Amino acid sequence: MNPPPPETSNPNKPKRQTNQLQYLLRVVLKTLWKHQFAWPFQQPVDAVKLNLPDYYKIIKTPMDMGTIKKRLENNYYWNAQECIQDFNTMFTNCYIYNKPGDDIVLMAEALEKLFLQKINELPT
């Protein structure tokens, strides 16, 4: 049984649009999305479909690029740092659930390096 996915809207949370958050959607997320190793990370982990019944017994703060994308489209974040923290949660979850050298880990590590290159310089 999968948990509910992370929220992509919250009326109690203030919204904001910044140049940096626009960039994280238009440039960073949409470039990572096209990477050959992006597909495992484009939606929440379906533990039922993927036959990973222990996934959410281990990962208690799930995050994925589909959720991040919807948050960016919703102007859900206050600032770029909040969105960057969601990317880092996504990568860290993969490294927690899996072991060094696993195929999925190699995929996450390549995306993380590309992510860090793209956010090295943000607009002002």
CB of 102 to ligand 96U, least distance (A): 7
Q: Which three-class secondary structure string do you get for the chain?
A: CCCCCCCCCCCCCCCCCCHHHHHHHHHHHHHHHCCCCCHHHCCCCCCCCCCCCCHHHHCCCCCCHHHHHHHHHHCCCCCHHHHHHHHHHHHHHHHHHCCCCCHHHHHHHHHHHHHHHHHCCCCC
Q: Considering beta carbons, is residue 59 or 80 the nearer one to ligand 96U?
A: 59
| C-beta closer to ligand 96U: residue 21 or 59 | 59
The residue ranges that bind ligand 96U (CB under 6 A) are 40-41, 45, 50, 94, 97-98, 104
The residue nearest ligand 96U at its CB is: 40
Nearer to ligand 96U, 36 or 120 (CB): 36
Q: Quote the least distance from Cβ 28 to ligand 96U, whole Å.
A: 18
Query: CB-wise, 19 or 106, nearer to ligand 96U?
Result: 106
